[PDB]
């Protein structure tokens, strides 16, 4: 199934009436607008390209402006593709919003994790032949990379305020982009 692009708003808790505190990451999933539909004939695979949010009209480059103008949609803050299952089809310009998750129990959330910079082996790898083999665990850049966390419980889908509350932590800092896909493991 397709996913949606959201913004990490931050973490909070939900108190259940039987007194459980559920740590939730609040994802602001505002309407995702289909900017392009890809099919086997023209593209070799089936996907939709969505955008979201809004963009500075004077900071939309003219290629980007033309690409959005073909779709008849307003320029968003990025473009993301979602692969399509055969039963699924969408139309260019159509808007997709968070109640797509209204019946989804678990999701996968992928974002760019926080950047730890140049991290040593202790932080990065939990350290304590005549050559070094490839993949040797060494110090280097940590974080600031695509990370997916799988099978997060969906605590609440609030369509009116464009919210998705997933149980637990999701990668990245507040205000970073998140791709939320219905859980693929399931």
């Amino acid at each position: 199934m397709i996913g949606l692009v959201g913004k990490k708003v931050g973490m909070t808790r939900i108190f259940t009436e039987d007194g459980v505190s559920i740590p939730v990451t609040v994802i602001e999933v505002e309407a995702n607008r289909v900017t392009q539909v890809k099919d086997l004939a023209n593209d070799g695979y089936r996907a939709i390209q969505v955008t979201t949010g809004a963009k500075k009209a004077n900071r939309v480059t003219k290629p980007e402006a033309g690409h959005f103008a073909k779709a008849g949609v307003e320029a968003g803050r990025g473009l993301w593709e979602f692969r399509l299952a055969e039963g699924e089809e969408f139309t260019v310009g159509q808007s997709i919003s968070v109640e797509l998750f209204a019946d989804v129990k678990k999701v996968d959330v992928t974002g760019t994790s926080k950047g730890k910079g140049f991290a040593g082996t202790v932080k990065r790898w939990n350290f304590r032949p005549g050559k070094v083999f490839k993949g040797k665990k060494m110090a280097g850049q940590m974080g600031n990379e695509r990370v997916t966390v799988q099978s997060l419980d969906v605590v609440r889908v609030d369509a009116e305020r464009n919210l998705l509350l997933v149980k637990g932590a999701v990668p990245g800092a507040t205000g970073s982009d998140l791709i939320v896909k219905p859980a693929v493991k399931a």
Binding site: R13, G19, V20, S21
Partner: protein, 123 residues
């Protein structure tokens, strides 16, 4: 959060006063035992006229910890000291007849209903 070498008070009247955790049971390379976990101990101090004697090696279940226990709403219960209740080596049942000080709801399991029953308080 008990590990090997940790000294624990005894919450029962089995005769031992202080025990030292000598191995944390329940998994390979398991580091810590929290409230409700089984540990092999050795007796360090006991009353002269008690049912267990200094140097005895037997199991125990941790009932109070300074590290505390967390509740599903996020709350946490902390005690001033680490306390255990002696269990038999094979039956794994309490050896004393009373429990001193409170224990927690985390022992409310079929294995440890004795301690809940004997507890002055079950927080």
């Amino acid at each position: 959060m008990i590990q090997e070498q940790t000294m624990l008070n005894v919450a029962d009247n089995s005769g031992a006063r202080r025990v030292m955790c000598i191995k944390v049971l329940g998994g390979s390379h398991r580091r810590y035992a929290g409230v409700g976990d089984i540990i092999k101990i050795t007796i360090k101090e006991a009353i002269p006229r008690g049912k267990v004697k200094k140097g005895d090696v037997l199991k125990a279940v941790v009932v109070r910890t300074k590290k505390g226990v967390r509740r599903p709403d996020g709350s946490v219960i902390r005690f001033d000291g680490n306390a255990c209740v002696l269990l038999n080596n094979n039956s794994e049942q309490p050896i004393g007849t009373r429990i001193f000080g409170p224990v927690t709801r985390e022992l409310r399991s079929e294995k440890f209903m004795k301690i809940i029953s004997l507890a002055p308080e079950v927080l």
